[PDB]
Design a protein around this ligand. Structure first.
Ligand SMILES: Nc1ncnc2[nH]ccc(=O)c12
Length: 303
C-alpha cells in the first residue's frame, strides 16, 4: 500500500499475543505500527474493523491512521498504523513515575472519558455503536505528552446493535487479561448475550486501573510502589482459577490504604474504585457517571 511503502520502521517496541508494535516514521512524523503475520489476518482485520467504527475518534481513544499490507519480497506483513505516544503504556508510565494529585485526576478522567465515549451509543446516519473493550488494563492504555490517557488495544472489542440488542461478534468464550476479569467473567455467570454486562465488566477493570494510578499519587512525598492489582494475592500471569478463588470466593479486592481518606482527591478516587468493584455488575458506576464525578473534581483542583 501507498501508506506502508512510505513508512520506515525504526524500533520494535512490543511483542504481544496478537502482533508486534513498532515505532515508525511517516511523512517525517512518529507513528506506531502494529504488525501481524499472514496467519494473524483475522486478528488484524477485526482490529482494523473496530478502529474504523464510525465516529470513534476521540481525544482519549488511540488515533487510528490506516490498515495496510507490506510485501518485503519474501512475506506479507499486515499493518495497523496509529498515533505514537512516547510515554507508551500507563503501565510503563506508572512504573517509571509518581504522579501529582493533578496528574492522577488527569490520567483517571481521560481514561473515564475515553471509556465513556467507547460505551456511548450515538444515534444517526453517522451513528456510533456502543463498544465494550473486554481487555481494559494499564498495559492497554497509553499516556499522551499532555499527561492524559487514551485507550488502545481495541482488537478484542465487541459492538452493540441497539435495535435488536445483539453483539456483532456474538461472543461465546472468555477473553482478556485474567487479572482484570470481572467477577462475573471469572465465574462464567456473565450473560454473553447482554451487552450492558460487557460495559459493566469494563468498569470493574477501570476501577482496577484507577487503583494502580492512585498508588502512584505523591502527596507530601508519600506514595506506594507500583503494583498490579492483586499482586498481594495471585502470582504473575495468574490463572482464571487463581483469580476466581480470590475475587469471587474470598471476595477480596485491591486494598484501599486508609490514608487515601486523608486527601479529597484520593477519597473521590477510592469511592469510585469501590463503586467499580461491586460483585454485582448492575450496582457499578457507569463510565459517564465517573467522567462526571472526576470532571467536577478536576475543575475545583484547577487542572
Ligand atoms: N500506539 C502506541 N504508541 C506508543 N506506544 C505503544 N505501545 C504499545 C502499543 C501501542 O499501540 C503504542
Amino acid at each position: 500500500g501507498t501508506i506502508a511503502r512510505t513508512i520506515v520502521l525504526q524500533e520494535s517496541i512490543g511483542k504481544g499475543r496478537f502482533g508486534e508494535v513498532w515505532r515508525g516514521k511517516w511523512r517525517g512524523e512518529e507513528v506506531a505500527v502494529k504488525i501481524f503475520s499472514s496467519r494473524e489476518e483475522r486478528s488484524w482485520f477485526r482490529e482494523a474493523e473496530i478502529y474504523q467504527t464510525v465516529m470513534l475518534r476521540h481525544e482519549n481513544i488511540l488515533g487510528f491512521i490506516a490498515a495496510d499490507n507490506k510485501d518485503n519480497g519474501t512475506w506479507t506483513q499486515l499493518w495497523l498504523v496509529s498515533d505514537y505516544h512516547e510515554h507508551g503504556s500507563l503501565f510503563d508510565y506508572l512504573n517509571r513515575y509518581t504522579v501529582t494529585v493533578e496528574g492522577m485526576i488527569k490520567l483517571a478522567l481521560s481514561t473515564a472519558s475515553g471509556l465513556a465515549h467507547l460505551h456511548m451509543e450515538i444515534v444517526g446516519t453517522q451513528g456510533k455503536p456502543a463498544i465494550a473493550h473486554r481487555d481494559l488494563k494499564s498495559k492497554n492504555i497509553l499516556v499522551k505528552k499532555n499527561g492524559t490517557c487514551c485507550i488502545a488495544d481495541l482488537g478484542l472489542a465487541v459492538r452493540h446493535d441497539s435495535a435488536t440488542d445483539t453483539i456483532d461478534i456474538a461472543p461465546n468464550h472468555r477473553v482478556g487479561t485474567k487479572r482484570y476479569m470481572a467477577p462475573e467473567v471469572l465465574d462464567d455467570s456473565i450473560n454473553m448475550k447482554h451487552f450492558e454486562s460487557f460495559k459493566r465488566a469494563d468498569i470493574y477493570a477501570m476501577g482496577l486501573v484507577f487503583w494502580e494510578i492512585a498508588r502512584r499519587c505523591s502527596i507530601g512525598g508519600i506514595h506506594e510502589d507500583y503494583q498490579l492489582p492483586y499482586y498481594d494475592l495471585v502470582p504473575s500471569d495468574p490463572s482464571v482459577e487463581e483469580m476466581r478463588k480470590v475475587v469471587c470466593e474470598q471476595k477480596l479486592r485491591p486494598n484501599i490504604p486508609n490514608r487515601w481518606q486523608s486527601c479529597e482527591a484520593l477519597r473521590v478516587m477510592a469511592k469510585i474504585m469501590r463503586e467499580c468493584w461491586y460483585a454485582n455488575g448492575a450496582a457499578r458506576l457507569t463510565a459517564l457517571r465517573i467522567k462526571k464525578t472526576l470532571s467536577q473534581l478536576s475543575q475545583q483542583e484547577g487542572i
